[PDB]
Design a protein around this ligand. Sequence first.
Ligand SMILES: N=C(N)NCCC[C@@H](C(=O)O)N1CCC1=O
Length: 323
Amino acid sequence: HMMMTVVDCSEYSADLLALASRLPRIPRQDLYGFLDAAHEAAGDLPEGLGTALDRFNADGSHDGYLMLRGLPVEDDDDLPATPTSTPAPVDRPLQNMEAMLAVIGRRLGLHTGYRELRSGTVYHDVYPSPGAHHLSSETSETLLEFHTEMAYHVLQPNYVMLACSRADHERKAATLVGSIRKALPLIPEEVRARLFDRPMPCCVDVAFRGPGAIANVKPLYGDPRDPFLGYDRELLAPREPDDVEAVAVLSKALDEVSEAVRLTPGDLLVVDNFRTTHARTPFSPRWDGKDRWLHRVYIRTDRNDQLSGGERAGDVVDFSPRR
Ligand SMILES: N=C(N)NCCC[C@@H](C(=O)O)N1CCC1=O
């Protein structure tokens, strides 16, 4: 990854805590007002952090992510026990890394929930569960394979944001990012041509099944010289042999350029969900009250037909498959 891809925020700690101190303490009681307050704070971010975010937002980067480090997370003993259920309690007090997702998220765009997913909530806790389905972010011992988040969804978000309150005990779990800007040079022009703008059948995540490959996903699309990426190692279901072979080439190229990010407390990862695919490698939970704990939100921006007018940060949208 490039120098500019990692932003050390430790010098900003007091300023960021001051911004958090004026946000509503019980965000889920009035999420729209909470995120409006966070938008006001976003305009007051430290100049260097605001600039890094704005630059990345304009047109992503070669790496496809922005990693903020050293944000003012609570000490471990000042955090509650790691959640073991979803959705979160409506009265749960705001945590510092959630405040960062609010302020840094509003600098980028509009927080978005998905009605059928995690009870239609905007803030997701990402924690291990002992019976996790293999297509669940609650997995641990089994690799969560590469996916563009909701690539099959008409209202797919520009960004996935992951903020770390607890790492896993052994700091083993790696968040993998595969950037199409790094992978594309490894893909032959002939395979690029087969992938580009070609809709292929795609299954959907369990939350959206209510059924087979009810969506169509274009693995590459947009500008052929700098394409967007829609990839899902588990759900993409090409039928034609040439399509299966083209996707296999794409899949191996993303593997070869994959970068591993190990999230630690105070880290916040912004993933460009139109140009990357992401994964999480195995770890072993201990069920001791201190298991790995991320906070996840989704951000929409005004491009790629994510928005059609009037949307607000906090909106929850219904499922429509890409066709
Ligand atoms: N290749 C895949 N699709 N893996 C499952 C993604 C994780 C899943 C979850 O949060 O449990 N998810 C992301 C949107 C949604 O549902």
